[PDB]
Symmetry: D2
Subunit: 311 residues, 4 copies
């Protein structure tokens, strides 16, 4: 018998709710939206409101809200958005201690009810939180993935598209490294209809676009005043969920476990990835200049510093 | 030159923001999201977050947030979601009069910059607020429309689909009048696969579905705590916008100005409508039973009552 | 590991190819397009032409053209469009017996390589050809299905839409039995925005729409000069395939095996069905008037009559 | 009032019909399918068939078949697929006859041309129309990049979504691909596929149209060409400002003028908003020079 895919979204706040609604609209599977017992009723309210949209938008989906992880049993994909979010002036690194505990508590319940699932993590700081989920899970590395690069290249592409007055569809970006201020946007691997951006955009304006990408999460935090971005992070999660569920073998930046690639091991890092029905099918190694190699090395040091703060 | 449709959404809260994001993903036009000066930055945050999703979801649309109505100039369609969140223990009169003042202020600036726009109104109470928008615009009646019935039919279809374990695609509801006590459903014009629902669902369970539809807004409030539905309301506005922008000539329940239809004149009422490129193309006049006529007379009496609260 | 659905389409003519292309652009699965050994190369050309559209239209799907049923192994769904048109100087008896022979040979190869698949049959006459697939497969009845009523309701809806100048989305048709004189339309369960059509269209013009639906296949045959309709038949097959692959539990008219429904057994007949992940989830039994029962009894004699033409 | 876009497709053969069905499914506007008086009824049949699918696929569009150009009045876009040395001279006369009726009923329309050889036929459509260069476009590069992307995706076992190609000039020997400006997820293909396999993919791309012809035995490709037309139509109707290869009128770009050539383009609401000029190596300028010579050769066969 033909059975729907099942996606559990852990954390039913801004990012989780926005993710859930996109997953159901795209009919990518049944959705279980999970929060803490104190936010059970709000979570069910969000889930029923989304389901009540299904006849207008013309989609078939089950959406439920729960505080009971038994409702996540046999999920194909579990998306983790559970944790504390930042306010203006905070680094993503300021959340490590609270979020690590949430990741350990969440992973333990997820692997109990869905021992065969793929896990995609948003929770900040995401390199260190995806690492925590990996180790707690006991899963092989292909099955635990972080989102950062899709969102960072998305922001990059938006600003480039505004600069050149072209469709975002024909702009390509390339971000490696941690999801931090030390991100390594590779302008050399960045194009407008395949044309190197360095040939199209003067260095000063291109440098400003690279800096605006680095500070992109902060820009949304400062505008909102009382939370962080959710539309583009949710979109970024859905693209990664869709690559796996439909076995698309996309080349996408994702937070992956390294065992030698770029000359690093035992860390999660933002790298180029093949993403398919088996999760991360492989980490792609670019040939880097010594300047890019150095920029990446600073990124890895930030990651390891954050990992030293884990219990 | 071919130019995009332009949609302004007035009020950048949960419903306005959710509507803007759906409109952009469907590439129905460029979106201008408007709120009060005090929320200029949050509104610009939401709009820029949505645009940053565009390279990932693969849509071409411009989204800006603003507090300057000059940014709304030459909108084809304006959606009004502006209104105050009812104060704990505020009188219905003070609500009507506070929201009436907002519709008057909003409508003045909208018609100044967009003299040819179609306006769709969500603001509660939608009958009296659409009436307020109509009289202040001095637009013809075909161009000033309220949302109500589409949201009630959506909830009705969800509940019927749950009862019968079938797709929402193959359920239809039929509602005249507004929300709650003011709703006039025709179960006799309500079907699963074109089969009367009275032949498929026992009377006690069908009456319970009709009641649950009446109370359906309050059901989401009670689950959320401090808030009201936005996913299904947003979907409802988008279906009505889409019907006009693509000249689809849908049959949809809408809040329309009457001039003799059903016996009534000088009022806005939830009635079946052909909705297309000239907005309300006509009000459809059913033959109603004596019971139905008297349920509608009582609904119209509730509508006259709210109109007497206006200044 | 997540794996794409696999759909084999048997017969790479107008309907089969049109069907394969729609299935691919919807990313419903990988498509295997099968024809006779003599048409191997044109079938590969069609498949590769479709595949070369994938980067432009933006779908991830494999499409291959073959004469080797080994390529159909582990198909979730098989769509049988294989068949021969009535050649000038051929009896109807010979036409039926030729198509029966094709159904026997195709089914034997299909079930050898896909013992767990659902089968959807287009080949006319669909009632007798579906029965042949059913008897040959050894499959339970829920897994062997014919297309007929979806295509008839589609033409009916198109004609009503034109008559009323409204969206086809808001029109519904209801038909039991087959095409032509075998069609049993229930205009009383056919609506525009849930309004019975008998109230909106005078009887003469409405009877003319019913008769044009009966003749609908013939109208396209007579307009083309060579061959029969393929766009609407392909779309009808795609709606039924999607209902099963996505477990939609649609209510759709289907050619279903009866074991007592409507007072008939051991035949395939056009009936309302719930269509989902287990295939036909049930046949829906309506209360019919004496007029409707008499009309459906003539349709049943026509089915039994073609079954008597089978070897 | 809000009113649908109107698209006329001239030639209701395999490519015209396939284009029309895609345009209506995507709700890009009303479709008018046009052919010769002798095929009026088959044309109405295909159009009615496509319309009868609309309730099932859930799209709202009008689709009509005709041999009367009066029905194409006020078309926002007109796609020309009508056609069949002597090849040039016959198809040229089809273009002049078509353009004359098209500009008569739709003087303000954008025109996209498929008819082979599309360089000369787009030139003929341009001169006859008297339209500015921005309103008369040929399809070629999108089709060639689609085949290339398909071959590369197969070679690397990855999504066609993350493969890009870059072709100047026309089909076959006339095709000037820039493998250096072709990538998988932004990675240069020269670092992913060895030269022998990449050369074979470039050669398959050149022969790609011939490969479908040989496999079919009784016509040429229609699915990928129709998709190539729809993407260019969509860039214009929805003012997307896509960068796409297109057959465009040159007034100095790449050092050439008074010809149509396959060049990178910004495609939006005003049709071709600009011809993009990039720095070519000396090998690529030489190849483009050879390609342009071949376009001048076919342009001399025109009456
Ligand atoms: N142990 C837990 N189990 C389940 N849900 C939890 C748990 N702890 C917290 N949550 C829930 O996680 C949700 C987080 O949502 P928001 O506070 O709205 O934050 P959001 O914007 O979604 O960001 C979530 C996360 O992703 C990053 O972008 C951000 O920095 C943060 O780490 C809240 O609803 C909260 O109750
Ligand atoms: N004069 C005004 N101009 C513009 N925006 C305004 C104005 N007055 C209020 N607003 C804005 O309207 C928005 C209303 O959003 P929410 O309070 O979040 O309510 P929402 O869920 O969006 O529902 C919109 C409206 O529809 C009805 O359900 C109800 O009447 C509600 O106010 C707020 O962001 C508020 O700042
Ligand atoms: N044994 C077989 N196995 C596989 N394919 C076969 C076989 N016998 C014939 N076919 C193929 O079936 C295809 C039928 O295509 P068309 O003749 O173009 O007919 P189409 O418009 O697709 O209609 C398909 C069929 O369904 C009904 O409408 C009608 O009964 C018609 O035969 C042809 O390509 C034919 O070679
Ligand atoms: N003057 C004309 N006006 C309109 N239509 C015409 C005219 N002359 C011919 N046609 C029609 O053009 C159609 C061409 O369709 P096909 O022969 O099937 O060719 P197709 O596969 O659609 O390719 C169309 C064209 O594009 C190029 O690939 C190549 O030049 C080919 O001729 C036919 O229906 C033919 O009757
Ligand atoms: O910055 C944040 O806090 C959330 C996030 O990860 C992002 O938006 O980049």
């Amino acid at each position: 018998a033909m059975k729907r895919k099942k996606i559990s979204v852990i954390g039913a706040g801004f990012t989780g709710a926005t993710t859930a609604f996109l997953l159901a609209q795209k009919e990518l599977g049944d959705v279980v939206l999970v929060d803490i017992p104190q936010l059970e009723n709000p979570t069910k309210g969000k889930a029923l409101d989304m389901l009540e949209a299904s006849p207008v938008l013309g989609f078939d989906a089950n959406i439920i809200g729960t505080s009971d992880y038994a409702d996540t049993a046999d999920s194909d994909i579990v998306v983790i958005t559970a944790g504390i979010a930042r306010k203006p002036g905070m680094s993503r690194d300021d959340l490590v201690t609270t979020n690590q505990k949430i990741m350990k508590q969440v992973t333990k319940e997820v692997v109990k009810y869905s021992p065969n699932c793929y896990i995609i993590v948003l929770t900040n700081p995401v390199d260190a939180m995806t690492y925590t989920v990996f180790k707690e899970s006991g899963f092989p590395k292909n099955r635990v993935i972080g989102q950062s690069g899709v969102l960072d290249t998305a922001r990059f592409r938006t600003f480039v598209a505004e600069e050149l007055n072209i469709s975002v569809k024909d702009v390509t970006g390339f971000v490696l490294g941690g999801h931090g201020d030390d991100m390594v946007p590779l302008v050399r691997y960045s194009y407008a209809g395949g044309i190197p951006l360095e040939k199209l955009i003067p260095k000063d304006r291109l440098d400003a676009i690279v800096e605006r990408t680095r500070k992109g999460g902060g820009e949304i935090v400062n505008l909102l005043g009382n939370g962080s971005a959710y539309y583009a992070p949710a979109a970024s999660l859905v693209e990664m969920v869709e690559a796996i569920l439909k076995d698309q073998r996309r080349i996408l930046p994702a937070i992956a476990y390294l065992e030698g690639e770029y000359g690093y091991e035992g860390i999660y890092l933002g790298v180029p990835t093949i993403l398919g029905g088996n999760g991360i099918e492989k980490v792609i190694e670019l040939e880097l200049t010594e300047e890019e190699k150095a920029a990446l090395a600073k990124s890895v040091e930030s990651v390891k510093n954050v990992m030293r703060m884990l219990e």
